[PDB]
Ligand binder design. Structure first.
Ligand SMILES: Cc1nnc2n1C[C@@H](C(=O)O)N(C(=O)c1ccc(NC(=O)NC3CC3)cc1)C2
Length: 167
């Protein structure tokens, strides 16, 4: 028994709720929150900008030091950094950005990073401003992640479509 309240059960290990991931993190303070990162950890908009604003830019400050030492991530890759005021840890995961010409097949590799953590609060990778279809992202998530994932979907109409079309 963990602290996630109001999630609807989709599979043995995947749960879904209509809420902003940033607001879910502030309330729950999970062990791991997943950020929809880019390879530069430049958190300007979307999930990344939203979570970073909630950290008063401390996420960006930590991220810039990480990149200065280690260089960019790979598309499909991840790193673990502080969760600041939102979580114990933030798992920054880079899904392909199809609006930028990146390969959608890399979405499975991105979700595989979740398997290194027993429980995660997460958004739909590669969706939103990354350009992939949310329905597809949920399918890859369910078919790739084996650990316990709590998906927070901000958009009510998208949430309803994801639940109603789920196979
Ligand atoms: C439509 C559509 N198609 N795909 C998606 N969306 C909307 C949204 C969702 O979950 O429904 N998605 C995101 O990536 C996202 C989710 C949450 C956030 N938080 C956010 O801005 N907080 C504001 C500042 C307080 C930003 C971006 C995926």
């Amino acid at each position: 028994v963990n602290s996630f309240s109001g999630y609807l059960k989709l599979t043995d290990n995947v749960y879904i709720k209509n809420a902003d991931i940033v607001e879910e993190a502030k309330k729950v303070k999970p062990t791991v929150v997943v950020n929809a990162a880019n390879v530069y950890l430049k958190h300007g908009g979307g999930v990344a900008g939203a979570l970073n604003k909630a950290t008063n830019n401390a996420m960006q400050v930590e991220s810039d030091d990480y990149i200065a030492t280690n260089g960019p991530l790979k598309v499909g890759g991840s790193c673990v950094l502080s969760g600041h005021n939102l979580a114990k840890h933030c798992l920054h995961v880079v899904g392909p950005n199809v609006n930028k010409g990146e390969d959608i097949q890399l979405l499975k590799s991105a979700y595989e990073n979740f398997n290194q953590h027993e429980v995660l609060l997460a958004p739909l990778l590669s969706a939103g401003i990354f350009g992939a279809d949310p329905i597809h992202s949920l399918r890859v998530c369910v078919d790739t992640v084996r650990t316990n994932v709590y998906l927070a979907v901000f958009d009510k109409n998208l949430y309803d479509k994801l639940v109603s079309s789920f196979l």
